[PDB]
Structure formats: C-alpha cells, structure tokens
Design a protein around this ligand. Structure first.
Ligand SMILES: CCO/N=C/c1ccc(OCC[C@@H](C)CCN2CCN(c3ccncc3)C2=O)cc1
Ligand SMILES: [Cl-]
Lengths: 245, 286, 245, 39, 245
C-alpha cells in the first residue's frame, strides 16, 4: 500500500512492486501558467496526451566503480517524439516532469543510489588542474542530450559544491535491499513564466552511487539503471519554423 | 455534450519560538515503532525526543527571529573595491568604469549562493579615502549607467552631464554616501545560477564563455570620477558595500566548499579538492 | 503489527522488526508495593529513570554444541549503574523486570532457543557422581553475576527437574526462521514485600538451545546472543552504608 | 503546576464441569486458519 | 488473507500458507439432487462425514522432463474408504468434489503446473501412428484408478485438442514463485441426475507442467506433487450387492 504503485499518463503505464513512496518536489504539483503570471500574449498550444506521456531514455550500466551520471531538462527530450517537435517549432516552453529512475537487483546484491533533482545545475571545470586556466564546459557537457553524461568528481558534483548536501534537494534513494525505483514529480521552476527549451535547462537529474554496488562472484553482474520521464502540463508559445539550437 | 473527454500539501505557520517539549513516560508495546525510519522515501526523520526517551516538560521561549533570511542578509558587506591611482598602470585619467558584479568577494557571495533565486532591494554605501586611509578635500561624482546608456570615456565626457542617469556628488571628507536601489531585473528575481546560454546558435568552444551568463543579472555600469577639468593629485580607493533588504529567496542548495576562482562561474582547483570536513586517523578515536 | 515493536523506558529504546509478541509473566504487570502488603515503615526511595532503564549485559556465542546459559535476578545488576548503587546502599529492594534476549541469524540458519524465567531457581550438584557426596554449588555458580553461567546438564536444568516441562513457566522461543528476540515482563514474586538484593535471587533467566544451531559451511558462524534487561518499579528501603555482599 | 512530569488481563471463573462440545460442520475458506499456530 | 487458507471437512483439515484463492467451477457449489430433477424413486443414502472427507492419493515426482498426469472421477476413489464401498454397493451415485493439488519447492526453483478439470474427458489413440488403425484406449488408460496415468502427447491432451485452450475450463496454475497449491471445487455435471460410479467418469483432473521444472545442481531434486480430494454431497441409490466393475 506504499511499496506497490502505478503511474498512468497518456498511452503509457509504469508499474512497480517495490517503491518507497513518491516525492512531490517542494510540495507543489505541476500546473499550466495562470493569466496573472503570464506575459506572452499569444494563445499557447497544449498538446496534452501526445507530449505528456512517459519516454524511456537509454540505459546505463552500474559498475562497482561508477562515478555517477546526470541529465538536463528539457534537453533530454528536445529531440524525441512530438514533445521534441513542439520544443523545436516554438520559441517558448514550460512544463513539469515525472521522473522515474529504475534499478533492480537481487536480495543478495547491495548498494545505494542517490537520485536527486538540482534546479539550475551549472557545471564547472577543474580550471586546468592548477586553477590558473579559466576554461569552460563544452556544449556536449552542459547539454549531453538524451544519452546523459558521467560525473568526473561526484564528491563536488563537478561544480564545487558538496554531494553530502544534495539531499537538501528533492530526492529519493534507491537502496537495493529496500526499493527498486525512485519517483520525483517536479513542477516548473524559473524566474520567468516561459522559456526557451533549447537555451535553458531548468534543472538536472543526478543519479549517484553513494554506496558502491557489490555482490559475490557468480551473481548477475549486469545491473542496469533506466530513466523514464514524462512531461506534465507542457505548454508552448511563439510558433515559427523548427530550430534545433 | 457531444465530446465527453473535453471537460500543495504545505502551508505557512508563524513559529516565534522553538517547540516545547512535552513530558513523556515509558512506552512498551508492539505495532508502533517511531524509532524506525525509511530514509529512501526522501523524507527526514519525524522522530522526536519524547519518542526515544523519557522527557520532562520544557517551556521553550527561545526566539527563531534571528534566523529569518531577512536578518541573515540585511548586514552590509563588501562587494567591490574601485581604485583610481594617479601614476602607474591603472586609470590615471581621473575616472573609472566598473561593470556591476557582486561575485568578486567570497563572504557575501557564499551567503547568496545558498539560494538559487533571490529578489530584493539594496542599500549601497560608498566609503572613500586615500590608499592609506587618509582623507582630503576632494569632490567626487558617482554615476549609475544603465545598460544601453553611453559610458563616459574621459573625465570630461558629455555623459557626466547626467541629465537622466542618477548621479551622486559628494566630498571625500563627507560621511559615506548612501542610497537605496530597487529590484531592477527584467525577470522576477535575480539568479546566481543559470544553467544555459544567453543566445541561440551553435556553441563552439570559441564561445563557451557564454555558458552561465544571464543578461537578467547584468545591471550595467557604475562610473566614478573626480569633478574637474584638471587632473587630481590624489589617489582614491572606493569601497562599495551592499545591504540587502525586503528579500525573498527560493530553492536552497549545497554551500560552496571549494575556494572561489572566478566571478562568472563555479570552477574549482582540480588538483587540490578540499574535503568538506577535517580528518583524523581512525574512525574509532577522536 | 505484531512482529515489529518498540520498548522505550528511561533514556533507552529497543527496536525489533521480527518479534513474536510479548509475554507478561502470570498475566501481571510490575507495580510498586501497596500500603496493605508493606511492612517496613521507612519511606522508600523510587529513583525512577536512573534505575528503570535498559542495561545490556555481556554477549554469549551460540555454538553447534552449546549447552545453554542462565542468569539470576537481581544479581546480574547488583554492580551496574545507579541500580547497583541503590542495591548496595539499601538493605531492602523490590522490582519487576523487562527481559529482552536478542539473537539474529539469516534465512539460511536454523535453531531454536527456549527463553524462560524460573522463579526461585535453586541449583543442585551431581553429588560427586555416585550420589554419596552431599556437595553444594559454589557462590560463583549460584550467583554468577553479570557474566552468567553455563549449564552442565541442561536436560535436568542442573537441578533434577525436566527441561521438557520448563514451558510451564513464562517463556518464549527464539526460532531463527520466525523471530530474532524474546521479551518477557516479570512482576516481583516473593513471600515477602521487600527483600535483600544481595542474599536472594527472585528468579533465574534460562536461555537453552533445544534445537541445535546449524548452517552450511560458508555462512557466518559467529551467532551471538545478547541479553538486555530493565528494572521496573524499582523501590529501595533501609538505607545505610554500601555493602557488596 | 510548575513541574508537569510530576503527575491484569486474567480473571477467575467458576468452571464446575468440563466444556461442552458444540456441533460444527465443514469450513472451506481463505484468510482464516485456526490450525496454524506460533508456539 | 488470500494466500493463507484452511479446508476442514469430515475428520480432515488441510492448511496452506501460500495459496492463490480458490476456484468454484462454473460458479456453482455442489448440492444434493432436488426433487424436480430426480427420477429414481428410492430414498437415497447420504453417508455424510464418512464419505465427504479428504482422501490423499499417491504422490507423483515432478522431473525436468515430465509430460503430465491425469486422473478420472469418481474412478480414483471407487476402491477407497467408505466412499468406495458405497460406490460398489449402489448402482446410482452423484457428488461434487474439492480438489487440492499440492506442490512446494524453494525460492530458487522455478516451473509452472496447469491444474485443470475437464468434464467428459474422452481419450483417443494415435491410431497406429499412420492413422489407418482404428485402435482404442485400454481400460487401464481410460480409468487408471487411484494411481493416475501419464500423458504421452500433452500438447493435444491425448485427445486431438489443444492444451493451449485448456484454460477455458475451471483451473488454477501452481507457479512455484507464487503459490504451492491449487484448489478447485467442482459441482456434479452430467446429462442425468445420478449415474454409475463405475461405468462413467464425470470429469478428469489434469496436472501438466507447461513451464518445465528447473533448478541449479545442488538444490533438492525430489519435487513431489500430491493430490488430495474430497467428495461433497455424495448421494447413493439403487442398493444391492457389491460390484467392482
Ligand atoms: C547614483 C549612483 O548610485 N547607484 C548605485 C548603484 C548600485 C548598484 C546598482 O545595481 C546593483 C545591482 C545589484 C543589486 C545586483 C547585481 N546582480 C544581480 C545578480 N548578479 C549576478 C552576478 C553574477 N552572476 C549571477 C548574478 C548580480 O551581480 C546600481 C546603482
Ligand atoms: Cl562636467
């Protein structure tokens, strides 16, 4: 009654028999932009079921020495399904998201993944090691797309901030002996009512193994981690020709 | 009707004092287990003193007012040092243009970066003197040059006519000048972190310096000069202090734990990654 | 709702996620001595939280050939914490007890421990083997203190009485496939309202492996048994100088 | 009040005779299991 | 509350801690024959508890290559207990049945048994292989008695009909990871109110491993399947001397 759950939206349904509740980021549900906050005057387009449905991105392999991964929203979907198309044809965009990270093992495996949502996840470089080089992250690192990227220094989240404090953000743990997934519902967060789905990532999703994976030789060693996400209340405005970036 | 298909669990409370403690006795039973939790849910423990031990009653009158974000931020702090030397490398022309950026000093910066978005008014105080702290009878002009307005190019530039821009004329011997500044962003709040790019187009390594730059935070230029057609014989140091007031903050984040390297980004010294906490020899000894 | 439990008393709390209910010896809860039964006239001292709290005694190791162990009350605590001190400074004493025996293994281990409370547990000797020697148990055997003692003939409880009938006394079983602890609440039992905590043990606690421990080679072999106890409604009277025995 | 902190499930019955036995029929169902115990 | 169950009838009781509900064939409970449907005029005999009780037949061994087994009713009991005796002494008979197939393994074994009840289970032969020989099943195959028989071509149920469609009949699955038994209550089914328990089998019980048994070397390999059945509302008429066939 708290470990079992079903998420149905659009023409997609997700099930799980070993959940650990669901988190509503900052206690707020996604919602279309009201007339008091809106500023752009054109009537928005709200595709509904064609874009607010679950999308499953590539799977990652959890190894005994994995550092962790991260994805950026809405970057991950800017080129997938009808959502991507609306994101490319419109200047303005806004929406919430239902993030469902999946990972199952056996009652003999062990390990804990911290799944968190960090809004405005700005990355930094190691500054040439010495700190005298003012280098910057490449486009491929700031917006890794659907494939996601790997963290090089998880301890400081590749941004000079302690991973030990990441729990101050909406999050769940996927502790193999307890649950096999994490679910976080994220509302739209920005200083503006709508924004470019191409030039700005509202938040990043981080999956980091704080407690390394471990198992005895002989047990299945391919332990994948899959990410399935669903836009919620997706709105679009400022229609024109398609633009990829 | 021809087509049928076409048809916050958190509230604020006023807590002026710390929670009291109710007296509790011993609990010996099954089914109920307050001590056991499931951190996986993402929730913090709800266990309280009385659930784990026998407590007495404590009428706690401890105030919670000093930790209100308002009292945490409304303390003037250094955000800029503008020097204007008479002889040397820097501007010996008697005028200086400074692009407004409050990320040049650590103390105040680390406090602001505790949050993602912040909206506020500010009180700016200008402490001016000679490099050695002495004071002389010198007349100065401070001018705010908003984005798009012509920046002065010399000590006699027409821009100093300041017919529309706001200017402050004061003597180095007067008390520090002080003025209030409103919330001026085109957006609804300033943001210390902007995970994106300012414009469209390809983002080649040649222009990667664009990453993280949000015009909504660029408030313009602060220009200063000595009032006169002739050069002044005095070196001048201007220390600018900012005091946040009428503040609102959104989305807390992990506090900076690596030294700051640059104003415009979170880059850290890769070869020397400091540990958030000091170390010891064994885990079983203090 | 019967397997999970929490025992909080004093500044101590015990938890368990695999219990098998709790036993209230003879259906009675501990209670301070009423004025009708009392005989000593001085006002008693009832320390409350400093003595009615959980105390954890040394741990024993369950081996495939262990005979069993026993402890005597209040002997086990006469030299521990503020309880011991009150027991030494006062002539008279009375109290009940909450006994919590702990022992966990894995879903692959097996074995059953009988945990019982036998009031007035008088020990006997083997009488020199032949039965012609009227020998008696040494002080170290009758009152083994906090360390507890080992049974030499569990079948007759070292007292000429059948272990097969010990279940006629307040008891619980710790059967590894079912539970990992036993809890028994014992009221004060004596022919007098108060008594010397030094010269008289009101009852003995027996932990006996009726079904031997067993597991396959490779599984953890160190299976400890820990005893945690808490005095309840401890009263003391007849104050004077401290006396250890 | 200045200091707040300072503030048998068995009965006899008369059973002169052995319990009677009530007539019972067959029980075929789930959820209920009288035969299973936890010693 | 759906996995645990107790079946008590007569002087017998069956328990199970891993059931998957109970099936009432065609939604009807067994019942004695009413006066409107009856045709034979003599007063029937309804032995009650001596015949409506659980009977346990021989056990079968599930191997990695077993084809499946079948039994016929009431043939299986025509020679057991007081039921058999009544079946032999009377010409007419009718009753329902409670079928309880048992099979337990371990959380490491796997396999699925389809347990079904097929009324009027008429067997066929392979017709000499070529199909030119009009051969017929021997008495030992049509009425295998209490021992039951083995299927030679489970895919066509030894009768030219697809096993894939057997689920159209009252049935349950015994999937080792889920449950350890199957229970089906069967009402009397025939074109006549009473019939000979010797010359006519009202239905056959089929236990077929659709998903083969499997386990790693080292795990228990003797995985038995036991069949326990109980007549319900057994009636008999047309008394005379005993007749075995
Ligand atoms: C008559 C002259 O007096 N005028 C003084 C004055 C002082 C400050 C003025 O604007 C101050 C803007 C600051 C309150 C906020 C600057 N911000 C907004 C967020 N931001 C920033 C910096 C680096 N990265 C992200 C954001 C900033 O640096 C304008 C005029
Ligand atoms: Cl001028």
């Amino acid at each position: 009654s708290d470990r079992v759950a079903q998420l149905t939206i659009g023409n997609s349904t997700i099930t799980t028999q070993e959940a650990a509740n669901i988190v509503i980021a900052y206690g707020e549900w996604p919602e279309y932009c009201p007339d008091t906050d809106a500023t752009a005057v054109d009537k928005p387009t709200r595709p509904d079921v064609s874009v607010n449905r679950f999308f499953t991105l590539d799977t990652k392999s959890w190894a005994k020495d994995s550092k962790g991964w991260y994805w950026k929203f809405p970057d991950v979907l800017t080129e997938v399904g009808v959502f991507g198309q609306n994101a490319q044809f419109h200047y303005l965009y806004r929406s919430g998201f239902c993030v469902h990270v999946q990972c199952n093992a056996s009652k003999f495996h062990q390990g804990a993944l911290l799944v968190a949502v960090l809004p405005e996840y700005v990355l930094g470089t190691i500054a040439g090691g010495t700190g005298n080089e003012n280098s910057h992250p490449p486009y491929a690192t700031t917006q890794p797309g659907q494939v996601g990227a790997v963290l090089t220094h998880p301890y400081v989240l590749d941004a000079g901030i302690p991973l030990s404090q990441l729990t101050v953000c909406p999050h769940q743990w996927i502790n193999l002996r307890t649950n096999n997934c994490a679910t976080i519902i994220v509302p739209y967060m920005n200083t503006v009512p709508f924004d470019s789905a191409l030039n700005h990532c509202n938040f990043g999703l981080l999956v980091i193994p704080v407690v390394p994976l471990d198992f005895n030789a002989g047990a299945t060693s391919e332990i994948p981690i899959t990410v399935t996400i669903a836009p919620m209340c997706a709105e679009f405005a400022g229609l024109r020709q398609a633009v990829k970036q | 009707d021809p087509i049928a298909d076409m048809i916050s669990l958190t509230a604020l409370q006023v807590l002026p004092t710390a929670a009291n403690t109710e007296a509790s006795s011993h609990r010996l039973g099954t089914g109920v287990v307050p001590a056991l939790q499931a951190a996986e849910t993402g929730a913090s423990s709800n266990a309280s003193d009385k659930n784990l031990i026998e407590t007495r009653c404590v009428l706690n009158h401890h105030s919670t007012q000093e930790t209100a974000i308002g009292n945490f931020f409304s303390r003037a702090g250094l955000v800029s040092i503008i020097t204007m030397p008479t002889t040397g490398t820097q501007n010996t022309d008697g005028y200086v243009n400074w692009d407004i950026d409050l990320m040049g000093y650590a103390q105040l910066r680390r406090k602001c970066e505790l949050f993602t978005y912040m909206r506020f008014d500010a009180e700016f105080t200008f402490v001016v003197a000679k490099p050695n702290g002495e004071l002389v009878p010198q007349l100065l002009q401070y001018m705010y040059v908003p984005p798009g307005a012509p920046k002065p190019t010399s000590r006699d530039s027409f821009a100093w006519q300041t017919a529309t821009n706001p200017s402050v004329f004061v003597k180095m011997t007067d008390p520090p000048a002080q003025v209030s500044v409103p919330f001026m962003s085109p957006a609804s709040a300033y943001q210390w972190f902007y995970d994106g790019y300012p414009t469209f187009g390809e983002h080649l390594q040649a222009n990667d310096l664009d990453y993280g730059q949000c015009p909504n935070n660029m408030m313009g230029t602060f220009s200063i000069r000595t009032v006169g057609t002739e050069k002044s014989p005095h070196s001048i140091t201007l220390r600018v202090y900012m005091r946040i007031k009428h503040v609102r903050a959104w989305i807390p984040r992990p506090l900076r734990n690596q030294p700051y390297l640059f104003k415009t980004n979170p880059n850290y010294k890769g070869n020397d990654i400091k540990c958030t906490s000091t170390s010891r020899d064994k885990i079983t000894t203090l």
